[PDB]
Design a protein around this ligand. Structure first.
Ligand SMILES: C[C@]12CC[C@H]3[C@@H](CCC4=CC(=O)CC[C@@]43C)[C@@H]1CC[C@@H]2O
Lengths: 219, 221
C-alpha cells in the first residue's frame, strides 16, 4: 500500500495567474507498459470527479491546453497556466502504480478576489418551532471573501459557545464569494428567559465586528 | 455517449448488507475495466474495487472479504455487493469506466449515497425564517428556511417550486447527534414580499416527506 501526499491543502490563485499542485508518492512510481500511472482529476462543486491528465502528462480529450502535467519518481505536479473562474474546485492526483491505486488527499483551488464583507441577517425562532419546545436563532452571512470568519453568539450580552452549528457553501464560480450559516439552538424555556440575541461577525475586512440582533420581546 | 448511473444506496444498519447497481450504456460493457470509487465526508477519494474485462476482481484492504464486485454482461449492469457494513463504509459511491486498459477513470456517474448507522430515519422539521418587522428596509430582503431533525441525507430545497432560483444559498447539512440540520436563504426585492408569496419546498426521499412552508412576516399583531 503506497501513500500519496498532496500539497497544498488549499490554493488561492488570482485569475490569469498560474496554479501549481504537487503530489509525492511514498514510493517510486512503478511504470506500466513504460508510461507512469499518474493521473489528475478535478471535481467541481456538486459534480462528479473528471479526468484531466493521465499517464502523468497526457491530456484527456476536451481538457484545455491550459492544463499540463509533469513530474517523475514520486514527484508529480499539475500546472494551470492561467487560471479561469471555471477551474474552481478540488483537484486530486491518482497513483495507480500498484494495487490498491491511491488518491492524493485533494487540493481545493480557490479563486482569489477582492475582499468583501458579508451581508448579515439574523432570524428569531419561528412560532411553529417554539410551539414544539425548540428554539433556533439563525444568522446568514452571505457573499464574503476571504473565507476565514468568526461568528460569536451573544445572549443578553454574554458569549454562547454550546449549541452552535455552522456551515459554509463551496466558493461560487459566479462571484468567487463564500456564504455561511450559523445556527444557535436552545430550549424554548431559555429563549424566553432572555431578551437580546446577536451574532457578531469578525471578518478580515473590518476590525469592527458586523453585528445583527433583535429582542425576543419585539417586532 | 458513455453513461454510467448508480443506484441502490440508502440507510443500512452496521453488519448489514446492501447491493449497489451501476447501469452502463454507450459502449461494449465487457470490453472495459469497471471500478467503484467512494468519497467520504472529508471529500477524500478511495478506490474500492475493480473488475477487468478478464473478469478478474480486486479490492481495497478495508473492503477485502466483505464486498464483492461483479457484472451482468447481458443486462449491462455493474454491481457492488456489500456486507458486514461498518460505519466506515458511509460515503458516496461512484462507478467509473477505465479510459482503456488500466488507464484513467472516466464517465463517473452522479453517484449513490450509502449511510451506515443505527439512527432511525426521521422526517425533517421545516421552519420559516422571517426578518425583524420592517424597520431595517433597503431595496432587498433576505428570507430563509430551516430544515432540522431529519435523517438520513439527502433532502432537497427549492423556492416557489423552482420559480425562485436566483439569490439562493442552500447550506450543506450538518450532523449533530444522529440528526441533520440544513438551511437555505433567499434574497428578494423588499417590495415583492410579503406582497407576493415566497415559499420553500422541502423534500426528504428517505421518509417520503414533502413540505412547503410559506414565509410569513413575523406576527407583530
Ligand atoms: C481503476 C483502473 C482499473 C483497475 C486497475 C487500475 C490500475 C492498477 C490495477 C492493477 C491490477 O493488478 C488490477 C487492475 C487495477 C486495480 C486502473 C486505474 C484506472 C482504471 O480505471
Amino acid at each position: 500500500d503506497v501513500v500519496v501526499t498532496q500539497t497544498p491543502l488549499s490554493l488561492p490563485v488570482s485569475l490569469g495567474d498560474q496554479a501549481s499542485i504537487s503530489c509525492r508518492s511514498s514510493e517510486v512510481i512503478v511504470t506500466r507498459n513504460g508510461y507512469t500511472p499518474i493521473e489528475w482529476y478535478l471535481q467541481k462543486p456538486g459534480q462528479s470527479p473528471k479526468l484531466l491528465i493521465y499517464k502523468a502528462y497526457k491530456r484527456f480529450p476536451g481538457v484545455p491546453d491550459r492544463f499540463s502535467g509533469s513530474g517523475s519518481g514520486t514527484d508529480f505536479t499539475l500546472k494551470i497556466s492561467r487560471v479561469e473562474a471555471e477551474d474552481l474546485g478540488v483537484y486530486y492526483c491518482f497513483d495507480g502504480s500498484t494495487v490498491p491505486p491511491k488518491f492524493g488527499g485533494g487540493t481545493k483551488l480557490e479563486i482569489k478576489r477582492a475582499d468583501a464583507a458579508p451581508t448579515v441577517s439574523i432570524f428569531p425562532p419561528s412560532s411553529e418551532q417554539l410551539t414544539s419546545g425548540g428554539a433556533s436563532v439563525v444568522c446568514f452571512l452571505n457573499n464574503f471573501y476571504p473565507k476565514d470568519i468568526n461568528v460569536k453568539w451573544k445572549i443578553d450580552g454574554s458569549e454562547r459557545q454550546n449549541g452552535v452549528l455552522n456551515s459554509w457553501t463551496d466558493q461560487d464560480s459566479k462571484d468567487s464569494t463564500y456564504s455561511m450559516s450559523s445556527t444557535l439552538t436552545l430550549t424554548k424555556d431559555e429563549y424566553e428567559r432572555h431578551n437580546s440575541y446577536t451574532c457578531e461577525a469578525t471578518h478580515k475586512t473590518s476590525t469592527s465586528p458586523i453585528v445583527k440582533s433583535f429582542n425576543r420581546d419585539e417586532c | 455517449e458513455v453513461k454510467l448511473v448508480e443506484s441502490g444506496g440508502g440507510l443500512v444498519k452496521p453488519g448489514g448488507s446492501l447491493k449497489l447497481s451501476c447501469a452502463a450504456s454507450g459502449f461494449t460493457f465487457s470490453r472495459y475495466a469497471l471500478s467503484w470509487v467512494r468519497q467520504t465526508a472529508d471529500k477524500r477519494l478511495e478506490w474500492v474495487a475493480s473488475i477487468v474485462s478478464g473478469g478478474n476482481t480486486y479490492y481495497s484492504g478495508s473492503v477485502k472479504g466483505r464486498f464483492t464486485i461483479s457484472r451482468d454482461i447481458a443486462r449491462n449492469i455493474l454491481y457492488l455487493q456489500m456486507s458486514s457494513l461498518r460505519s466506515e463504509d458511509t460515503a458516496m459511491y461512484y462507478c467509473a469506466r477505465a479510459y482503456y486498459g488500466y488507464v484513467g477513470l472516466v464517465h463517473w456517474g452522479q453517484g449513490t449515497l450509502v449511510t451506515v448507522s443505527s439512527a432511525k430515519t426521521t422526517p425533517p422539521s421545516v421552519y420559516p425564517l422571517a426578518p425583524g418587522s420592517a424597520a431595517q428596509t433597503n431595496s432587498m430582503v433576505t428570507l430563509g428556511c430551516l430544515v432540522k431533525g431529519y435523517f438520513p441525507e439527502p433532502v432537497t430545497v427549492t423556492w416557489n417550486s423552482g420559480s425562485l432560483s436566483s439569490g439562493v444559498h442552500t447550506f450543506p447539512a450538518v450532523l449533530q447527534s444522529d440528526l441533520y440540520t440544513l438551511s437555505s436563504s433567499v434574497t428578494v426585492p423588499s417590495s415583492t414580499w410579503p406582497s407576493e408569496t415566497v415559499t420553500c419546498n422541502v423534500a426528504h426521499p428517505a421518509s417520503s416527506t414533502k413540505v412547503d412552508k410559506k414565509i410569513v412576516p413575523r406576527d407583530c399583531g
